[PDB]
Amino acid sequence: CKVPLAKNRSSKKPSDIYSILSEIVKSASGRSLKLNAGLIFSEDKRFTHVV
Amino acid sequence: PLRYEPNNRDFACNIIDDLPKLIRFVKDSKRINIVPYTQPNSLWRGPDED
Amino acid sequence: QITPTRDLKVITDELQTLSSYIFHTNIVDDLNSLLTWMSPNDAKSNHQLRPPSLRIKNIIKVLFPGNTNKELQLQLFSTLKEFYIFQVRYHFFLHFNNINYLKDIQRWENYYEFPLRYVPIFDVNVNDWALELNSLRHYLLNRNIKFKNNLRTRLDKLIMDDDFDLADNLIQWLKSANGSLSSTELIVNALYSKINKFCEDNMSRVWNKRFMIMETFNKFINQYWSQFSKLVGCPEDDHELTTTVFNCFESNFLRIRTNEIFDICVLAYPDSKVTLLELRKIMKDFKDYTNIVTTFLSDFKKYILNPSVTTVDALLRYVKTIKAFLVLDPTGRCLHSITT
Amino acid sequence: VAFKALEEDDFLKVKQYLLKSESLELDYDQKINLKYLRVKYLVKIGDYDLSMRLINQYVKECCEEVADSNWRFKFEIESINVLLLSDVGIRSLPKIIKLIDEYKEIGNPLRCVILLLKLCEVLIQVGKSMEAECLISCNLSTILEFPFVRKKTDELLESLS
Amino acid sequence: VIREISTPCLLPDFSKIKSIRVKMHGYFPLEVNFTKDYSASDFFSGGTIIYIQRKSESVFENKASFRNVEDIHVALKRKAAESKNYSRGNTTSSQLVESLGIQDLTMVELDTLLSAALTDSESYNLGLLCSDKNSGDILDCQLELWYKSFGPH
């Protein structure tokens, strides 16, 4: 009885010191489903036309 | 031009790339600004865009 | 494939006693002379690739012209088989580190099997001789790494020079050995290298033709597909293999055109424009377009963006690329990227 | 102090301390160290059947109870040391290679070199020390940068001579 | 009736499904049959996603003999796929271990063991592994004992 979820081991530029601090101070203050939709239906342009 | 192709027998991994690159402190008339670090001779040695 | 061994001394003593009891004659000296002749350990008394004299042949005819005599003869044949097997293994192991090419193993096989014609000991219905030979081949393949690499290089060399019969001989020999270096990978690698080189030879620096991939595919098939099918052994009408070969040809064509797209668009245009329409039929992934645009920009930037180039010719070649890329890409997104 | 005593071969001191371990209330970070200390002491004594059965249960619960990768790695190499010390290191060949390419992507130089020493040590107990000398020679430059592995590194050098 | 569908497809109602299987070249197959005890709805109650394990293209798997059929078509497809990534060599660790010559696990270990003796208990042990009902490089193993027992020394 242990539903151990698999942690997604995601993995690129290193950038500089100043950029990292600026990014964090800036952040201080459907997408997947759409991706699935692009995979659920393929091989045609029917979905864009109907939208 | 150096050609260091990846070889399994070479385990000499690099850590300087993983460590973030340094910066420089240059002050203009208005204020003190922060710019990315460039080697004094890197302008004519930098990886060319072309 | 279990093989028994009862030591050289014991089997030799058993052979002498059996010969003395059955024959009741002093052929033991002649028997020892024969054993030395078949034995490759001693290079002075063995055959050295020379046919035996009348004495040896007569003794064989005597040995190969009730029930107790028959079973004694059967056990004598078994002991002779064990002695010969022991001798060949010791001699092979003596020269194990001296093997570096296929021709060495064939000549050693001939060296070992030279007495076999003059003395029949292996039964026709039982392929024992092949069994230990395949066993030694398997050990040599799975113990000598240098020999394995040499076999790879030799097969690659043979397939590059269209030496198909020897390549087939090499492939059959490997298949009999059933070693870790399976023949399937070598055939795949050899065919892949050969098709790449054939593609590089043919569809390079030519862009003014239409549907030329089919022409190249048909030409390569008529020239090599029967030989390749004979090498693999699969039927000539293998549809899936031909389809995969065609897919690899079009992939190679895409790669060559991506490499050469700069000269395709700058110089060969509009004569090569037809090829562009063919290329448009093949590209399907965003990675393809990104690679194409970055390679073209690097070449255009490497050559055309030089201030040493006259500005009039620079803009002329630039607009030529614009119309060329517009024909290739009706959408024009690549045009925006190059423009930007 | 106990770790220093293991290096200085004060087996009497560490044995008495391990008695204190089983009935004291320790923080988790303190638990693993004494849990790790117990493994290293048993390797020194020579008895390996208990230690080998003991080390893998630790790492198994070092991957489920707590997802501590650093302590998963540190626990892993003693099992490598336990195997190869018992003249059977070939069993560890599948295990060591899974960590080599795994830590090459990560890029931690200490991780790659420690696995390198275990790989050379495996190759020298099989009878193929020739290629181990060739392999150690190309990488000898990048393995002296780490101080605590030099003692294991220098000691292998007189063995090859 | 067998119904073959792509992956991102809407399967019918769970109560009317009896078994589901996944088969594809690569990942080893997974087939689950739903009996009366557990239904498809209960199985997918935790989530409508089922995960699959990745097989391994390992050199140690193919020690001496290739149990795999190794079809020429799939081999060519794999070669083309690898070339696509390469277009977009001794750079892999498997080739390193191949270069080192320790490909056969059992042969290297027994070569180390036979290095010297040959006490009776281990001798019978090596005989038992040689006369194993089912194993891999049995023929290769038989030759080393013959070499150890009656070879040059």
Side-chain angles (χ1 to χ4, degrees), chain A residues 4 6 14-15 17-30 32-33 36-38 40-51, chain B, chain C residues 2-5 7-88 90-142 144-340, chain D residues 1-48 50-92 94-144 146-161, chain E residues 1-20 22-53 55-56 58-60 62 64-66 68-69 72-76 80-81 83 87 89-97 99-117 119-131 134-136 138-152:
Chain A
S15 181
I17 319 292
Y18 189 13
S19 65
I20 289 184
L21 295 63
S22 51
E23 183 278 327
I24 62 170
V25 67
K26 181 215 58 179
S27 57
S29 184
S32 82
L33 305 151
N36 305 126
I40 63 164
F41 53 84
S42 70
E43 66 183 1
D44 215 321
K45 314 202 157 303
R46 307 166 312 191
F47 192 100
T48 293
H49 176 68
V50 299
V51 174
Chain B
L2 62 89
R3 183 220 34 72
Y4 292 162
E5 61 88 20
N7 193 311
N8 287 119
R9 315 211 152 193
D10 186 74
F11 285 151
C13 183
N14 193 325
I15 193 66
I16 295 95
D17 57 358
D18 296 331
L19 183 64
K21 303 160 201 174
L22 300 174
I23 64 176
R24 294 179 74 90
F25 286 101
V26 291
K27 165 218 168 185
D28 73 84
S29 70
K30 181 69 180 67
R31 186 180 65 248
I32 310 177
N33 172 337
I34 309 169
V35 300
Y37 166 59
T38 57
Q39 311 187 26
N41 273 347
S42 73
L43 184 43
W44 69 279
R45 293 183 56 180
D48 203 342
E49 297 83 357
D50 311 308
Chain C
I2 298 99
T3 78
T5 299
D7 292 333
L8 188 153
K9 318 292 283 314
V10 167
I11 62 171
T12 308
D13 300 332
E14 290 173 353
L15 278 172
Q16 58 90 1
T17 48
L18 284 171
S19 62
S20 76
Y21 158 78
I22 292 163
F23 273 6
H24 292 303
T25 55
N26 201 18
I27 301 171
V28 296
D29 194 300
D30 291 331
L31 189 66
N32 291 336
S33 303
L34 260 67
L35 294 174
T36 52
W37 194 70
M38 283 74 74
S39 168
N41 198 353
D42 47 353
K44 300 295 187 291
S45 285
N46 55 3
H47 48 85
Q48 309 105 22
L49 294 174
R50 59 85 182 169
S53 81
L54 183 86
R55 174 63 268 148
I56 300 101
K57 205 172 184 177
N58 291 347
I59 295 161
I60 301 299
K61 298 191 275 295
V62 170
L63 289 171
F64 305 89
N67 219 27
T68 50
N69 213 357
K70 180 67 173 66
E71 59 90 15
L72 284 159
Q73 181 64 294
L74 287 165
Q75 188 274 331
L76 192 79
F77 291 165
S78 67
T79 311
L80 292 172
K81 290 177 182 191
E82 284 156 88
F83 162 80
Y84 194 53
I85 287 166
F86 183 81
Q87 262 303 318
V88 65
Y90 193 75
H91 188 277
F92 177 77
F93 279 164
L94 281 180
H95 298 109
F96 172 87
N97 57 330
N98 302 349
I99 308 303
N100 286 302
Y101 299 102
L102 203 57
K103 61 184 292 294
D104 314 328
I105 195 66
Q106 270 91 24
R107 76 178 177 84
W108 281 128
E109 284 178 354
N110 291 115
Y111 187 73
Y112 294 143
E113 74 186 3
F114 186 87
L116 189 151
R117 277 95 66 188
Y118 294 102
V119 59
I121 302 295
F122 283 100
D123 201 354
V124 179
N125 72 329
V126 63
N127 43 36
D128 284 335
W129 171 284
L131 284 172
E132 69 274 10
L133 264 292
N134 289 341
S135 84
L136 278 71
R137 298 165 178 173
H138 173 267
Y139 184 89
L140 182 61
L141 188 154
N142 293 129
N144 195 337
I145 56 165
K146 66 182 180 297
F147 182 73
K148 185 176 262 174
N149 301 345
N150 294 347
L151 292 180
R152 286 187 173 180
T153 57
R154 171 161 258 280
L155 181 60
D156 293 330
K157 283 182 24 163
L158 286 169
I159 201 66
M160 65 183 71
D161 303 340
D162 302 332
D163 193 349
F164 277 96
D165 54 355
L166 288 183
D168 186 1
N169 297 121
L170 191 146
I171 211 69
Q172 65 187 177
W173 196 85
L174 189 155
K175 181 62 70 173
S176 75
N178 206 14
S180 81
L181 182 69
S182 178
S183 57
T184 66
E185 289 79 1
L186 283 296
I187 294 169
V188 164
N189 286 333
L191 62 77
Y192 202 78
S193 189
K194 199 67 175 199
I195 62 182
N196 291 354
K197 189 157 184 177
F198 191 81
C199 291
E200 291 143 13
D201 286 338
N202 292 271
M203 48 171 169
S204 65
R205 214 66 46 72
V206 181
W207 303 278
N208 57 348
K209 314 286 188 282
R210 186 164 35 74
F211 302 122
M212 81 76 68
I213 56 168
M214 282 73 80
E215 298 179 354
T216 46
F217 168 75
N218 288 338
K219 195 177 174 187
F220 181 82
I221 286 295
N222 60 43
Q223 282 187 335
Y224 298 110
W225 195 241
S226 62
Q227 296 152 328
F228 267 108
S229 186
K230 182 192 54 62
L231 290 172
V232 184
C234 289
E236 182 67 26
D237 65 326
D238 206 335
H239 50 72
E240 293 177 350
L241 200 73
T242 51
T243 304
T244 55
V245 167
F246 195 81
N247 284 344
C248 177
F249 289 167
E250 66 183 1
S251 302
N252 265 286
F253 167 80
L254 181 153
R255 181 181 60 113
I256 291 171
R257 292 324 177 216
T258 51
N259 286 335
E260 299 174 343
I261 191 167
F262 178 78
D263 291 336
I264 289 168
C265 295
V266 171
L267 299 183
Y269 199 75
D271 305 333
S272 64
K273 186 259 286 180
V274 182
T275 292
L276 277 297
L277 276 296
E278 200 156 3
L279 294 174
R280 182 171 89 173
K281 165 43 42 183
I282 298 159
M283 57 190 95
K284 287 177 187 165
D285 196 77
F286 273 30
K287 175 223 82 163
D288 313 329
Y289 321 128
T290 50
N291 183 238
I292 286 173
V293 65
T294 56
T295 310
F296 188 82
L297 284 181
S298 75
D299 291 331
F300 193 111
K301 177 260 286 182
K302 181 268 174 196
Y303 296 119
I304 305 298
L305 297 185
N306 195 342
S308 72
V309 189
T310 70
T311 183
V312 286
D313 291 331
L315 61 84
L316 180 49
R317 270 80 63 87
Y318 177 78
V319 299
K320 207 45 159 162
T321 61
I322 301 299
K323 48 191 284 184
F325 277 51
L326 192 153
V327 175
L328 183 63
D329 182 26
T331 78
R333 298 182 181 94
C334 66
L335 294 174
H336 296 91
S337 304
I338 62 167
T339 296
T340 310
Chain D
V1 159
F3 274 106
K4 286 283 305 310
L6 276 296
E7 302 276 339
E8 298 314 338
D9 291 331
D10 197 331
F11 297 93
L12 259 183
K13 210 195 279 294
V14 64
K15 186 165 192 168
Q16 296 284 16
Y17 194 108
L18 183 63
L19 264 294
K20 289 242 182 181
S21 46
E22 60 208 299
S23 181
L24 277 156
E25 303 71 354
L26 283 296
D27 170 29
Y28 173 85
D29 184 358
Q30 304 158 353
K31 214 73 61 173
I32 298 295
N33 274 1
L34 61 78
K35 187 180 285 186
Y36 171 68
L37 183 57
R38 185 191 325 254
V39 174
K40 280 224 297 189
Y41 162 71
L42 279 293
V43 173
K44 259 53 173 184
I45 295 286
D47 47 348
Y48 308 137
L50 73 159
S51 68
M52 180 60 204
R53 64 191 81 216
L54 190 50
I55 185 167
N56 70 6
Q57 64 85 29
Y58 290 162
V59 62
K60 190 201 72 69
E61 83 183 9
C62 185
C63 190
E64 298 325 281
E65 196 197 25
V66 175
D68 195 312
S69 303
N70 265 6
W71 277 125
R72 188 168 64 203
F73 171 77
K74 292 188 234 178
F75 285 161
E76 275 318 317
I77 312 300
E78 301 53 31
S79 71
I80 297 171
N81 271 322
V82 171
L83 299 194
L84 187 158
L85 194 152
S86 64
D87 291 330
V88 178
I90 301 299
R91 313 278 213 282
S92 179
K95 183 67 180 296
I96 58 167
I97 62 173
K98 277 164 284 281
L99 282 296
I100 285 173
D101 64 354
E102 198 265 5
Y103 272 99
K104 290 293 288 296
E105 66 183 0
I106 298 288
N108 188 359
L110 183 62
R111 302 277 190 261
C112 61
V113 65
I114 193 66
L115 297 179
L116 180 63
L117 277 296
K118 304 301 180 291
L119 185 72
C120 55
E121 195 85 352
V122 169
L123 183 62
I124 64 168
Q125 78 158 206
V126 302
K128 320 174 83 174
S129 88
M130 195 36 48
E131 192 76 0
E133 191 275 334
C134 183
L135 189 144
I136 196 68
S137 167
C138 66
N139 275 216
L140 61 77
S141 66
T142 185
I143 68 171
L144 271 295
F146 306 147
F148 92 98
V149 73
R150 76 181 288 99
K151 185 269 178 182
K152 205 61 181 295
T153 300
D154 64 358
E155 190 268 335
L156 276 296
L157 284 192
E158 69 274 12
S159 72
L160 61 83
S161 73
Chain E
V1 62
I2 298 314
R3 319 176 40 208
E4 183 71 22
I5 64 170
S6 62
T7 314
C9 289
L10 271 45
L11 77 172
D13 275 353
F14 307 156
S15 61
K16 203 144 50 189
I17 302 190
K18 305 294 181 63
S19 70
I20 294 301
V22 57
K23 303 144 160 59
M24 51 66 58
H25 65 279
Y27 297 100
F28 58 78
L30 178 60
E31 175 176 24
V32 291
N33 45 359
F34 304 76
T35 191
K36 310 172 196 166
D37 287 331
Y38 66 87
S39 67
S41 60
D42 204 317
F43 181 84
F44 285 80
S45 63
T48 63
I49 297 89
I50 62 180
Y51 317 124
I52 191 61
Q53 179 146 1
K55 179 175 298 186
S56 65
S58 172
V59 171
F60 294 166
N62 290 318
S65 179
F66 299 75
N68 300 326
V69 65
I72 175 62
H73 302 92
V74 299
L76 179 54
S83 71
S87 67
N90 57 334
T91 186
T92 178
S93 69
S94 64
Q95 293 178 352
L96 185 63
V97 76
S99 167
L100 289 180
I102 298 89
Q103 297 294 90
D104 174 338
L105 288 174
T106 65
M107 161 175 178
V108 164
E109 177 79 338
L110 64 89
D111 187 358
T112 300
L113 177 52
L114 291 173
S115 71
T119 299
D120 186 74
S121 189
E122 75 264 1
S123 81
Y124 286 165
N125 190 3
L126 61 83
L128 179 136
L129 54 87
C130 295
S131 161
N134 47 3
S135 292
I138 59 171
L139 81 168
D140 194 352
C141 294
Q142 303 190 13
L143 180 67
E144 291 84 4
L145 71 89
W146 181 17
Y147 181 83
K148 177 57 181 67
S149 49
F150 315 122

